[PDB]
Amino acid sequence: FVNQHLCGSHLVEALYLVCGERGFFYTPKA
Amino acid sequence: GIVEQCCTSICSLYQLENYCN
Known part of the structure; x- marks a missing residue:
């Protein structure tokens, strides 16, 4: 599920699944 | 960026894991 174009909610969903209990930062304008 | x-x-x-805490 990670090896594709991931935009918007699809990208946040991937970060969520990948990072688990570590959590993540999402910064689309950086 | 991402x-x-x-x-x-x-x-x-x-690349995704680069944004994990």
């Missing part, structure tokens, strides 16, 4: 790497181009596990 949009350039994962949205406008193809994402990777490697």
